[PDB]
UniProtKB/Swiss-Prot annotation, chain A:
Known partners and oligomeric status: Oligomeric complex that consists of at least the alpha, beta, beta', gamma, delta, epsilon and zeta subunits. Interacts with CAPN8. Interacts with SCYL1 and PRKCE. Interacts with COPG1. Interacts with ARF1 (myristoylated); this interaction is required for binding of COPB1 to Golgi membranes. Interacts (via trunk domain) with ARF1 (via switch I region); the interaction is direct. Interacts with KCNK2 (via N-terminus); this interaction increases the channel-mediated whole cell currents and promotes plasma membrane expression of KCNK2. Interacts with STX17. Interacts with TMEM115.
Protein function: The coatomer is a cytosolic protein complex that binds to dilysine motifs and reversibly associates with Golgi non-clathrin-coated vesicles, which further mediate biosynthetic protein transport from the ER, via the Golgi up to the trans Golgi network. Coatomer complex is required for budding from Golgi membranes, and is essential for the retrograde Golgi-to-ER transport of dilysine-tagged proteins.
Other comment: Brefeldin A induces dissociation from the Golgi of the beta-COP and presumably the other coatomer subunits.
Tissue: Predominantly expressed in the upper one-third of the oxyntic mucosa and in most regions of the pyloric mucosa. Ubiquitously expressed including platelet, liver, heart, spleen, lung and kidney.
Compartments in which it is found: Cytoplasm; Golgi apparatus membrane; Cytoplasmic vesicle, COPI-coated vesicle membrane; Cell membrane
Residues of the full protein shown: 724 to 953 of 953
Highest classification ranks of the organism: Eukaryota, Metazoa, Chordata, Craniata, Vertebrata
Record's protein name: Coatomer subunit beta
Curated annotation (Swiss-Prot), chain B:
Provenance organism: Mus musculus (Mouse)
Domain of life: Eukaryota
Phosphothreonine found at: T185, T591
UniProt protein name: Coatomer subunit alpha
Record's subcellular location: Cytoplasm; Golgi apparatus membrane; Cytoplasmic vesicle, COPI-coated vesicle membrane
Assembly, per entry: Oligomeric complex that consists of at least the alpha, beta, beta', gamma, delta, epsilon and zeta subunits. Interacts with SCYL1. Interacts with JAGN1. Interacts with TMEM41B. Interacts with SVEP1. Probably interacts with PEX11A.
Amino acid sequence: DPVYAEAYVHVNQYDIVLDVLVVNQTSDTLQNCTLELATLGDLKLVEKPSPLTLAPHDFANIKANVKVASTENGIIFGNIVYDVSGAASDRNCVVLSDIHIDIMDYIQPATCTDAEFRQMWAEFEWENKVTVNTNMTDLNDYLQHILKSTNMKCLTPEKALSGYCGFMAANLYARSIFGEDALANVSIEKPVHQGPDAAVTGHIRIRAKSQGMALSLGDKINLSQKKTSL
Amino acid sequence: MLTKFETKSARVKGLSFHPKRPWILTSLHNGVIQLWDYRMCTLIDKFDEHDGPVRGIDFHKQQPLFVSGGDDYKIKVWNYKLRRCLFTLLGHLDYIRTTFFHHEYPWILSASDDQTIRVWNWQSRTCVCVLTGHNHYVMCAQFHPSEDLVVSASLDQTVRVWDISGLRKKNLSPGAVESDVRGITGVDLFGTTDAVVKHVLEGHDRGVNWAAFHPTMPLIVSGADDRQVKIWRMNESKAWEVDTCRGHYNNVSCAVFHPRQELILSNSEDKSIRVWDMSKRTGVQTFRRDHDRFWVLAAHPNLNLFAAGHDGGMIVFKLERERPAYAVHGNMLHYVKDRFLRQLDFNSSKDVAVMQLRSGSKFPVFNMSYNPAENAVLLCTRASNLENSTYDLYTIPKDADSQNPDAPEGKRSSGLTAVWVARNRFAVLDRMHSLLIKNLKNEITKKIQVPNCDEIFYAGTGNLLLRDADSITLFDVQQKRTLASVKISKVKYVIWSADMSHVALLAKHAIVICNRKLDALCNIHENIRVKSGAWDESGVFIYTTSNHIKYAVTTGDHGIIRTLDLPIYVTRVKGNNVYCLDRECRPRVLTIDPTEFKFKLALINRKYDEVLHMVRNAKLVGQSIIAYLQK
């Protein structure tokens, strides 16, 4: 419509913030509908610019701050239905459920003593694993990339050698914003001429408390793993 | 195609589908009224209207509101949306089956299951109407053709049809010839629910479960409290119309008309839904899937969805011809529905299914292919698996039931499917229920060729050959030696830039962009298992992006031309008069506004004039500087 509203999400530092362009290229501060607040996850949405005019030929920035540490809603991965309403110069609108709400980001790296670790590794919520196998790179650059992407930790090296092969299994740990600790041992082949690694066939073993997020994390990482057309 | 969601529970007497929404509002005699605006597989609200049972559900007529009835006997209208009660009166000695909203002075009609129904003025306070002619326990109350003319179905073993007035019931008339309501060979009985000879129709059939009307018409389609659900037409009034609708085992609680479909859907109690015609009529088949107890069936007056209601519970199933056929003629898109009718180019208000002399999403398609001309199409109909079907090929100047065999933009013949194949002029035709090759220089083509008989894949589906080859395999008109196959894959269609030479590729999920033949230019993927993105010609990448519609890329450019309008998908590009699609609705004709093309060229020549001139000015939407304006 003249009124075209375009919007995307910007998550700028904790705060997932809503860029909205409602552009009302309308022929007037056309009447506007209705909007509703809610508890969200460890967030709650929390602002609406008050008016409801769709000012003529006019462009507007409508900001929604979201509250990023509260409102539990357990509708995982978000993907929760959201409403913009048809309630005034509007007969309809958008009701939307979100998608676009993923993990790789959330968790931060976190750390451990290795013996205890091992013991723990085994000990943890075993229940998820996903496989590493396939890419576009060596796990040097590739590993770094993935690491940065998820913002997460590989705890320690043994020099055995991530180079000549290595035939290295890398142990990774991370802790998030709402505090889950997740453990990995992924054991991986690694690039190098007619030696081995341009796939893996390494297994990524994922432990996160619910299997459902945990495996999903293994996936998420799987998405993360490579670089291709989303 | 899919039954999106399904748990059997609810013991359901009354039912309605949202003519506007894909809601189902459901009345249980659990005492429950529920609105679930069915779309997001979520109930908005749920009120068990009273301790006692709930029989009734009807529309207000507006957009999203319920008017509801319980054994309370009360007419409530509560808006889900506004979660509030509109004006309130209770009910007589039984529940409320139908309601209608009117407004000289915002004025109201209420239809009821007992005694009377009263029509009330809260403005310049006078009487529009009084209806007596009901007694107790109305199964299915109905607005007629004339909406404010009506029929009712009763557990008092009558049917009432009433005449209303603006000062209570009356009609003036004196011209007719005979009557079908009652006047020649056959006809069914009066019942008693009222006392005026409009027609009280006999609702005895151990009582009548449902009554359903024929808009301008007086045919009724019925649910009945007999195995016999007996069909009568009062727009005929046949003999062997003393039809008892028969299961195998007992009942026929209901059997119903679908507004659109010239059909009857029956449902019953041997664990069944039974399938019936009504276009040429006959018991097609019976289908069994539990619930030896039901009382409602429904097909949406939105027609979105279709569903059947039962005691033990309920099911909703969703239709699609997931992915479905096309042709291009100047600045116009042709579609063949997955679900949904035409939408075969241009638009005007909310959604418009393209109805034209190039009927696309309509026919019983096996395959549709442009026979290029801005004036021709080739079409197979009777679709399906047979020995062979018919193809009637039609002229854009005017299509037909079958166009002229005389005309070669009209020809029809027999043949099962017709299919493209690679190295572009050979074709497949099936004209046996298996491999005929079709090959012509012309693409006004209908050619028959058994040579190239080569099964080892028996009649099925592919289109550059891919009986799930997972390859597009190139050939001539017989050979028993491959020319070659390339490993790449299809939506099971290859996309040509208009006619028959598009190295722009479809893939079912993902689509790949090539220039002609395999040159993988870039490869597309998204992950929504639904929509589209469009090419103007060979590889012009349009992508749809929310309420924003975007050029993925040009020259070295990327751009937002114009912005979308709720979901749309780019299908592809018909000229400058732009065309867009969400799948088959939620549509555009569009004044353009390119972005980018101009731009990387423009840019490449430093040129701004344009942008500027447009005064086009974003850089953020989330961001928007990030094509290369960031870089």
